[PDB]
Amino acid sequence: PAXPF
Amino acid sequence: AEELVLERCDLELETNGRDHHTADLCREKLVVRRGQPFWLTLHFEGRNYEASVDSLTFSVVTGPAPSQEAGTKARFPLRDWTATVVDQQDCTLSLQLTTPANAPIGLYRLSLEASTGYQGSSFVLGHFILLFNAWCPADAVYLDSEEERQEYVLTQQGFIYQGSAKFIKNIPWNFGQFEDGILDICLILLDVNPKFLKNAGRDCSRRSSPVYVGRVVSGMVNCNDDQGVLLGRWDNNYGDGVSPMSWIGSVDILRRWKNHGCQRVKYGQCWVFAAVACTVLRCLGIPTRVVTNYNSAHDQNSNLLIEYFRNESEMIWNFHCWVESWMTRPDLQPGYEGWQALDPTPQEKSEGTYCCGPVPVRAIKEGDLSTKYDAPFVFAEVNADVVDWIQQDDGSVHKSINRSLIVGLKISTKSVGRDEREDITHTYKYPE
Ligand SMILES: [Ca+2]
Ligand SMILES: [Ca+2]
């Protein structure tokens, strides 16, 4: 998945 | 002389498909690319065409309100829309037709009017679908490299980069643009877009432009605001749908959307939206590629800074994906032709809807942020400064540039004609 830092 | 009677019109699928690079699309219906000649053969039931006696006129129409002024209707005699005789044998007449390189794309109905000096008789010859033509020098989507046309229009399998700047990964992806029924679905997608629903005749005319089509697709690939394809979800709970990570290609998604009456498909994330957009655009004939940006920033207040608030906040993403599409930009000052960034993932509204682009990648690199569409947003994704607002024990807040996490790293797309990664960071931003 796309993950927000 | 008695009037002509048409037996049938042969759309010459095998020959047209090969010549027009549409062979996979031409299994059952004629699909051609604008600006280029194609063949038809008429079969007559009594006598054949006689030039001294018969006058034949062709008519083409697309969409629900065609008109010559809008380019969605044309009338032309057998002598930019043209028809000419190429051969005559027994009961058959071999014709060549040409379309303008700026004709609206889509489904046309072709008709024939025949006369010998009295009443005309009308025949429907059939339908054809007209697509963008990257092989044609006069087409806006012209791309002057055969190996690039193969990659960016004709190849149905690629790779999408994921992971993080430190740990790059990829997955294979089946774009599948020439699989059975997909083109039909692409036209459905255009035909249910809000601009069509509002003014069908105008929308159909505006489909002459790859800019307009590109913008439409960026909006229609997400279900937000419209009847679009995918619902995004990011919280790791996908039990009532398909996990974003389960998909291996676009075709299952587009079929699911169609099969349930243009209902949103659960679920996608960035690379899923980008990949489906790539399928649709390659299908329609616009050269397109999927790009991945690492440390991809989401600027929420258009100030080109990514602001974090810390103790004694906007987000940056491990990666983000969007697409680039190849075309001229006659709607801009000269010089901005080439790759245009289009982004179907919902992040920021553009004029009230969740669409984004097309924006010349060149405009991003040169910092020409007034260039339409959505240049500030895309600039910030690849070139924003990260600022920490750090609260001090004394109650003040110290603003500092954070240089540990750099926005916009290792921008990547699959290499032309090979299973390798091309770094294209240099196209979005100058080195410092
Ligand atoms: Ca939408
Ligand atoms: Ca900001």
SS (H, E, C) chain B: CCCCCEEEEECCHHHHHHHCCCHHHCCCCEEEECCCCEEEEEEECCCCCCCCCCEEEEEEEECCCCCCCCCCEEEEEECCCEEEEEEEECCEEEEEEECCCCCCCEEEEEEEEEECCCCCEEEEEEEEEEECCCCCCCCCCCCCCHHHHHHHHHCCEEEEEEECCCCEEEEEEECCCCCCCHHHHHHHHHHCCHHHHHCHHHHHHHCCCHHHHHHHHHHHCECCCCCCCEEECCCCCCCCCCCHHHCCECHHHHHHHHHCCCCCEEEECHHHHHHHHHHHHHHHCCCEEEEEEEEEEECCCCCCEEEEEECCCCEEEEEEEEEEEEECCCCCCCCCCEEEEECCCCCCCECCECCCCCEEHHHHHHCCCCCCCCHHHHHHHHHCEEEEEEECCCCCEEEEECCCCCCCEEEEEECCCCCCEEECHHHHCCCC
Q: Residue B328 Cα, ligand 2 centroid: separation in angstroms?
A: 31
Neighbours of B55 (CB within 10 A): 13
Q: Is the Cα torsion angle B307, B308, B311, B312 positive or negative in sign?
A: negative
* B223, B270, B278, B321: the active-site residue: B270
Same domain for B106 and B206, yes or no, is no
Same domain for B128 and B150, yes or no, is no
The angle formed by the CA atoms of residues B107, B111 and B112, to the nearest 5 degrees, is 155
Number of domains within chain B: 2
Mark which of B106, B140, B174 sits at the end of a domain: B140
Q: Is B151 known as a binding-site position?
A: no
Same domain for B185 and B226, yes or no, is yes
Same domain for B117 and B187, yes or no, is no
Range of the domain at B256: 141-432
Same domain for B272 and B366, yes or no, is yes
Ramachandran region, residue B422 (left: φ > 0; alpha: ψ -120 to 50; beta: rest): beta
Task: Please report where in the chains the tokens 């999927």 appear, as a residue.
Answer: B290
Mark which of B93, B123, B140 sits at the end of a domain: B140
Same domain for B96 and B173, yes or no, is no
Kind plus residue range of the DSSP H or E element containing A1:
none
Residue A3 DSSP symbol: -
Q: Residue B226 Cα, ligand 1 centroid: separation in angstroms?
A: 5
Neighbours of B229 (CB within 10 A): 29
Q: Supply B284's token pair.
A: 């329609």
The 3-state DSSP class for residue A4 equals: strand
Same domain for B122 and B151, yes or no, is no
Asked if B302 contacts B252 with a C-beta cutoff of 8 angstroms, the reply is no
Mark which of B140, B159, B192 sits at the end of a domain: B140
Say how far apart CA B345 and CA B361 lie, in whole Å: 18
Q: Supply B42's token pair.
A: 């008429």
Q: Is B50 known as a binding-site position?
A: no
**The residue type at B130:** L
Same domain for B148 and B268, yes or no, is yes
Say how far apart CA B119 and CA B154 lie, in whole Å: 46
Q: Smallest Cβ distance to A5: which of B234, B245, B316?
A: B316
Say how far apart CA B223 and CA B358 lie, in whole Å: 19
Buried residues in B180-211 as b, exposed as e (16+ CB within 10 A)? eebbebbbbbbbebbbbeeeebebbbbbbbbb
Q: Is the Cα torsion angle B286, B292, B295, B300 positive or negative in sign?
A: positive
Strand ordering across the sheet containing B409-414: B359-360, B338-342, B315-327, B288-298, B409-414, B421-423
Is residue B127 exposed (0-12), middle (13-18) or buried (19+ Cβ within 10 Å)? middle
Nearest to B218 by CA among B189, B184, B253: B189
CA Rg value for chain A: 5
For helices B251-259 and B182-191, angle between their N-to-C axes, nearest 10 degrees: 60
Say how far apart CA B121 and CA B217 lie, in whole Å: 40
Same domain for B31 and B98, yes or no, is yes
Q: How far is A4 from chain B (nearest CA, A)?
A: 4
CA B119, distance to chain mean position in Å, is 44
**The residue type at B214:** G
Same domain for B224 and B184, yes or no, is yes
Same domain for B37 and B172, yes or no, is no
Same domain for B154 and B228, yes or no, is yes
Please state how this structure was obtained: X-ray
Q: Residue B408 Cα, ligand 2 centroid: separation in angstroms?
A: 15
CB contacts of A1 in chain B (<8 Å) are 234, 236, 244-245, 269
How far lies B287's CA from each of B23, B186, B338, B340, in Å?
17, 15, 10, 10
